[PDB]
Design a protein around this ligand. Structure first.
Ligand SMILES: *[C@@H]1O[C@H](CO)[C@@H](O[C@@H]2O[C@H](CO)[C@@H](O)[C@H](O)[C@H]2NC(C)=O)[C@H](O)[C@H]1NC(C)=O
Ligand SMILES: *[C@@H]1O[C@H](CO)[C@@H](O[C@@H]2O[C@H](CO)[C@@H](O)[C@H](O)[C@H]2NC(C)=O)[C@H](O)[C@H]1NC(C)=O
Ligand SMILES: *[C@@H]1O[C@H](CO)[C@@H](O[C@@H]2O[C@H](CO)[C@@H](O)[C@H](O)[C@H]2NC(C)=O)[C@H](O)[C@H]1NC(C)=O
Lengths: 407, 51, 99, 51, 417
């Protein structure tokens, strides 16, 4: 017997809705038709802050969708808009799959427990940096983060990567967002021995970061910069520097691929699911409900273990947090004040494109990150036998006083 | 002082830990002085500074 | 039983329990072990001895309640082969088979 | 004091501070003083062969 | 003069009308500050019903402040209303039940917040009980809902002081997704005195089922239960292996109706501290349409300028959860016959248990807790006062009790600490 098992989604435009329905129709042929029926429902996301969600409950929850897909609004406005749905479905215990939400704001699964997305967050980009750090053998770096769940998460992830190694926490630097005056900290940064730098921030903040950094001549050769996708993009580039490593997520802009891929992957999660018994349909009707949906966590469990490595977006596997695993990034260079692909990163191993490496100062290769410090500031305490303290005799610093043995 | 770690970790010495704590000093000059001043009957510190 | 003890001694597994069934020689097994374990100077520990068989339809309940208490690392089992199958399924449920 | 790891006020978790924390902090790259060498400190920092 | 606009909602399975308390609060409300009230009630809670209704009342009239009342303890509800708060910027609070029940960390934009209490603090309350009778707790598990990771740290923070001699035996997570068994087999490994629970009553229901099979229900495995479960005072799952401490704020101790007036008073005083003190208290203005950013955020709204206030002289200073920083708490024990007998009450810093002696669960077993008195002398035992500065006894000593002499008196007397 075939029961159309509805699915639901929120997408940027009606064309993408048609793409969704098309992929769904392709879906019946791939998984067994007799066992289950697939039906597609979606919304074009008219921009109402608290009413789209109203309709999600009124229409989609009333339609008991077995799962929902979501994408970042086509209109280029707002940040992390898909907060409400994760809460709203949360009562429903209905799995949600995001296509375009690479933002780490919804990483907080203690309140975003029902939340998920195919793309890895900005924090996971650190996987690259550790591998990058691994190749070049610089164990000494500096980390500059904005102060928020995003930056702190990035720090936690990278440090966790380092934890397997002897923990490497030298020179972490936290600044708070929206701050135009940031030079003072960099003066502090010069002091530190390590010459390689990595940073995560928003585009607006990054302008201020580079603006302040250029004043103190931080960009000069013997210094290295590693950065997030957001940093290379936008206004960050214009008052922006040269020879700095950068990252861009593969197929990040285009959800449709992620739509077909996520749906194929979800299909494994639901079709396999029905192999199990004691299943319950998602709560039908928003009204009359206060209870969770017992199946939902199970649906999450299979869906996280869904496999489907072959895919339009690339290999698919999910980490413990529900974040995607081994997403491919394309390394970017600033050559001649323009973005170029020096190499591309896929899987656990980096790949080197034919293009010549660029660094600060123009050297083909710039491996050494330990110039070091000629002068050491030494500290002590006042302990009588091994240390003595006398005031400078007037201006003169010291006395010609002699040891018992004549010296 | 590092011996405080010994008293800390030594639950066996908890009694002494507090007994000690309540009389502690910012420095050796005052700690030696108390015994010299006879304010405090006993002083505890590592030998190299003390001998 | 002696060989079981020698094996345990060789790996120096001092602490152990015995799960047995009403199957023949169970009482003596305990007796032989008592003497063998008792004579030695060493302070090895016998944790539990369990004697169980189906009685009515609560054998699983009673067995499960009785088996659940045990915490020991090294278990000597004694029963018919088939019974061993059932006891092992039950142990797999109990989590006693694990590392 | 050279300093010891202690509860940081309300936070209750903090660096040893004093001479050592300045060292972690990077105020003083290297510490030359009469410092006893112990494991609690040892995990945090490298120590030379005892003098 | 000011003529503020306010709304309050009573939702319930227990009988009272908002009108009753409406006129009451306005009478009580009347002298202190100007207020205009619209009262509405709704029978059962839903994400859609509540959202729709609150937007329905708010938009029609430009109310500035409201409160929420319910006869239900559902866990999700708080978050939902909180979500509305992040977008609206309209102050909200709640006096009873679920809204009063704790919720996950508040967003950067201020939300509604009367329910939460530093869970850490809550645990320290529980620890006070543990300090009296609990050491080497059996287990602390981040099983479900908010703070699985968060609860985990504090236990460490509590343990980190190392003032006394604290320690843990069981430290795991998990429940529903796979066989309960990995967590269960791990749980089998722990062998300790007090079980610590941080899971919802629903989860707990299953956990009760787990514990009986597990053997946790048996003696030597006390349960420490928070509001996560405790919240359903009216309803206790029979399978809930009783005698374990279940404790949260009590309805009998404080009237549910009682909470609303005070809050209204606080609102009034907030306005007197904001409005009177050179500030404009703006209306909600836009809640149900488009995405225009609600004509931007109100300038100088000053909602959180005061977090530690009083009302009627009551120290109702608030926490980061908006919660009375003077936690008014009572200790409740799951009794032998489905009853939350008042185990004790918590006042300020000090922890109070009504009965000094530890109750024998059912019949005394294997001569447990034999009452032994050892005379004190230079040769064998020696008694000194506990470190009251910490409120604790010396680690290498034993905390001791005695009966404060009251021979003539009916009472045995208490000579504790
Ligand atoms: C399968 O789902 C689709 C999409 O939700 C349904 O198509 C809608 O049908 C309703 C009828 O109530 C129309 O009002 C909509 O215009 C249709 N498309 C939408 C909602 O955008 C379809 O009816 C469902 N199939 C069945 C058998 O119910
Ligand atoms: C941002 O603020 C910093 C700190 O006030 C400014 O740094 C000061 O620059 C002035 C020169 O105008 C010096 O006299 C001070 O000594 C600097 N401060 C310190 C720490 O001594 C900085 O000028 C401001 N931004 C800029 C570049 O205008
Ligand atoms: C986003 O997805 C669309 C649709 O899948 C891609 O458009 C396809 O581009 C390929 C180029 O090899 C064509 O062969 C197809 O005919 C196009 N439509 C399809 C596949 O149905 C588009 O390429 C994707 N975005 C990017 C940047 O690759």
């Amino acid at each position: 017997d075939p029961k159309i098992v509805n699915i639901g989604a929120v997408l940027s435009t009606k064309k993408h809705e048609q793409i969704f329905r098309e992929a769904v129709n392709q879906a019946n042929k791939r998984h067994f038709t007799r066992k289950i029926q697939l039906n597609a429902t979606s919304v074009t996301h008219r921009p109402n802050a608290i009413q789209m969600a109203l309709s999600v409950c009124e229409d989609l929850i009333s339609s008991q969708v077995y799962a929902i897909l979501v994408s970042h609004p086509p209109a280029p406005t707002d940040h992390l808009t898909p907060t409400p749905i994760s809460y709203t479905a949360g009562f429903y215990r209905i799995p949600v799959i995001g296509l375009t939400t690479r933002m780490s704001i919804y990483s907080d699964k203690s309140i975003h427990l029902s939340f998920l997305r195919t793309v890895p967050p900005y924090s996971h980009q650190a996987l690259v940096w550790f591998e990058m750090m691994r190749l070049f053998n610089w164990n000494h770096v500096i980390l500059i983060v904005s102060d928020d769940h995003e930056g702190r998460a990035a720090q936690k992830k990278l440090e966790t990567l380092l934890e397997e190694k002897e923990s490497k926490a030298d020179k972490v630097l936290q600044f708070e967002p929206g701050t135009k005056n940031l030079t003072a900290l960099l003066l502090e940064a010069k002091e530190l021995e390590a010459r390689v730098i990595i940073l995560s921030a928003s585009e607006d903040d990054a302008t201020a970061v580079y603006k302040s950094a250029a004043m103190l001549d931080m960009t000069g050769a013997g210094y290295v910069w590693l950065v997030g996708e957001r940093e290379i993009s936008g206004s960050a580039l214009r008052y922006a520097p040269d020879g700095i490593i950068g990252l861009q997520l593969i197929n990040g802009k285009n959800e449709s691929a992620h739509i077909s891929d996520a749906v194929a992957v979800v299909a494994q999660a639901i079709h396999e699911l029905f192999e199990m018994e004691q299943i319950t349909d998602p709560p039908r009707g928003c009204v009359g409900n206060t209870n969770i949906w017992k199946t939902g966590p199970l649906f999450k469990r299979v869906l996280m273990s869904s496999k489907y490595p072959d895919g339009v977006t690339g290999r698919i596997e999910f980490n413990e947090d529900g974040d995607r695993k081994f997403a491919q990034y394309s390394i970017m260079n600033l050559q001649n004040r323009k973005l170029v692909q020096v190499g591309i990163f896929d899987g656990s191993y980096i790949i080197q494109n034919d293009r010549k490496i660029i660094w600060p100062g123009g050297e083909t290769e710039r491996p050494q990150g330990y110039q070091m410090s000629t002068r050491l500031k030494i500290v002590t305490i006042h302990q009588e036998p091994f240390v003595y303290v006398r005031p400078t005799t007037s201006d003169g610093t010291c006395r010609e006083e002699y040891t018992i043995n004549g010296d | 002082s590092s011996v405080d770690i010994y008293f800390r970790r030594q639950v066996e010495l908890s009694t002494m830990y507090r007994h000690m704590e309540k009389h502690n000093y910012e420095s050796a000059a005052e700690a030696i002085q108390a015994v010299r001043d006879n304010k405090l009957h006993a002083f505890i510190w590592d030998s190299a500074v003390l001998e | 039983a002696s060989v079981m003890l020698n094996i345990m001694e060789e790996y120096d597994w001092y602490i152990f329990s015995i799960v047995t069934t009403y199957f023949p020689g169970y009482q003596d097994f305990e007796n032989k072990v008592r003497s063998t374990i008792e004579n030695s100077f060493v302070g090895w520990e016998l944790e539990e001895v369990i004697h169980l068989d189906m009685s009515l339809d609560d054998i699983d309940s009673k067995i499960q309640n009785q088996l659940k208490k045990l915490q020991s690392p090294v278990i000597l089992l004694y029963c018919t082969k088939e019974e061993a199958t059932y006891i092992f399924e039950v142990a797999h449920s109990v989590g006693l088979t694990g590392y | 004091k050279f300093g010891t790891q202690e509860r940081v006020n309300n936070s209750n978790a903090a660096a040893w501070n004093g001479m050592m924390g300045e060292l972690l902090s990077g105020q003083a790259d290297m510490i030359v003083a009469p410092l006893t060498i112990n494991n609690e400190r040892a995990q945090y920092i490298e120590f030379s062969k005892p003098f | 003069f000011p003529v503020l606009n306010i709304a309050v909602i009573l939702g319930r399975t227990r009988y009272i009308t908002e009108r009753d308390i409406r006129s009451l609060w306005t009478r009580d409300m009347s002298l202190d500050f100007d207020v205009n009230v619209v009262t509405l009630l709704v029978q059962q809670t839903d994400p859609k019903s509540i959202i729709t209704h609150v937007c329905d009342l708010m938009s029609g009239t430009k109310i500035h402040g409201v409160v929420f009342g319910d006869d239900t303890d559902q866990e999700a509800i708080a978050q939902i209303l909180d979500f509305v708060s992040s977008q609206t910027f309209i102050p909200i609070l709640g006096i009873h039940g679920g809204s009063s029940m704790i919720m996950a960390d508040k967003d950067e934009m201020s939300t509604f917040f009367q329910f939460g209490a530093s869970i850490k603090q809550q645990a320290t309350v529980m620890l006070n009980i543990m300090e009296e009778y609990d050491w080497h707790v059996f287990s602390v598990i981040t099983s479900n809902f908010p703070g699985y990771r968060d609860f985990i740290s504090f236990i460490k923070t509590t343990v980190d002081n190392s003032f006394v001699g604290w320690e843990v035996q069981n430290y795991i997570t998990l429940d529903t997704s796979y066989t309960d068994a990995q967590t269960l087999t791990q749980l089998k490994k722990i062998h300790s005195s007090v079980i610590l629970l941080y899971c919802s009553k629903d989860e707990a229901t299953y956990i009760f089922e787990e514990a009986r099979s597990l053997g946790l229900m048996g003696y030597g495995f006390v349960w420490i239960v928070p509001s996560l479960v405790t919240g359903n005072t009216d309803i206790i799952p029979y399978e809930f292996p009783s005698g374990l401490v279940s404790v949260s704020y009590d309805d009998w101790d404080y009237g549910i109706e009682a909470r609303v007036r005070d809050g209204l008073g606080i609102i009034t005083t907030a306005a007197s501290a904001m409005l009177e003190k050179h500030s404009v208290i703006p209306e909600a203005k836009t809640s149900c349409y488009g995405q225009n950013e609600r004509n931007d955020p109100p300038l100088h709204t000053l909602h959180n300028f005061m977090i530690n206030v009083t009302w009627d002289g009551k120290d109702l200073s608030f926490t980061e959860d908006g919660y009375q920083a003077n936690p008014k708490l009572v200790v409740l024990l799951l009794n032998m016959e489905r009853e939350w007998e008042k185990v004790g009450k918590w006042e300020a810093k000090s922890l109070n248990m009504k009965y000094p002696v530890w109750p024998r669960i059912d019949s005394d077993h294997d001569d447990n807790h034999l009452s032994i008195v050892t005379l004190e002398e230079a040769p064998f035992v020696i008694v000194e006062n506990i470190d009251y500065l910490t409120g604790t006894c010396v680690r290498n000593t034993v905390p001791c009790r005695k009966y404060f002499r009251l021979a003539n008196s009916t009472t045995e007397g208490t000579s504790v600490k």
